[PDB]
Amino acid sequence: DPEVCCFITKILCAHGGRMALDALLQEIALSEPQLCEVLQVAGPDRFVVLETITRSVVATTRARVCRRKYCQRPCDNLHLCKLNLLGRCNYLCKYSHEVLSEENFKVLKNHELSGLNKEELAVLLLQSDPFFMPEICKSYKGEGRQQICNQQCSRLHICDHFTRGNCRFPNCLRSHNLMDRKVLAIMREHGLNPDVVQNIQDICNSKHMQK
Ligand SMILES: [Zn+2]
Ligand SMILES: [Zn+2]
Ligand SMILES: [Zn+2]
Ligand SMILES: [Zn+2]
């Protein structure tokens, strides 16, 4: 049911975007096969199930924040301040700080996320929309060479395709490890804590299996 999915998303986001199946069952009030049937039918575009023997669920969405500076309407994306959600916008900003605006509520409705408050929505977006990640080094060509990039580098040395869930290269040498200490340090500065990065990592790992 749509009312069931929406409610799970809500529980997960209220616990930081991730829950172990045991903790979820003790909130949703369904049986393990009832909950698993819901999760599997909804798909990996809503819930990502992972075994770490210990089953865990990660909340995700196909909803996206508009990347344009001056966007000409109509637009099917959310219109908000990226920096404000990353805790880097308190100062004037030309982007909307009204998360649950009229236009955004319409978008949330298309993605069945109208139930969510601004905190739950932010948790969800920080781990689902690749737009919230730091800029990846444009001159990064992969590991195992002398010239990895054109510097002495302050940017991410990760596979750009992997973050967009479209790394289709047979034996890719560009890093897929967002859990690397050097990467986590760049993430922390951008406004993404290690728990958020762990969720991004697992959603990206899931997207890599389908494509
Ligand atoms: Zn737009
Ligand atoms: Zn702002
Ligand atoms: Zn670089
Ligand atoms: Zn790759």
**Ligand having the closest approach to the CA of 64:** 1
**Ligand having the closest approach to the CA of 78:** 1
Which residues make up the environment of ion ligand 4, defined by Cβ < 5 Å? 159, 162, 167, 172, 174
Cβ of 103: how many Cβ atoms within 10 Å? 15
**Ligand having the closest approach to the CA of 95:** 2
Q: Give distance in angstroms: CA of 180 to centre of ligand 2.
A: 29
Selected from 1.10.10.10, 3.90.226.10, 3.90.870.10, 3.20.190.10, the CATH number assigned to the domain covering 1-63 reads 1.10.10.10
Please report how the helices 2-14 and 21-28 are oriented relative to each other, as an axis angle in degrees rounded to 10: 120
Identify whether the C-beta of residue 172 lies closer than 8 Å to the C-beta of residue 162. yes
Q: Give distance in angstroms: CA of 113 to centre of ligand 4.
A: 31
What residue ranges do the domains of the chain occupy? 1-63, 64-211
**Ligand having the closest approach to the CA of 69:** 1
Instruction: Enter the resolution in angstroms.
Output: 2.5
Q: Give distance in angstroms: CA of 161 to centre of ligand 3.
A: 16
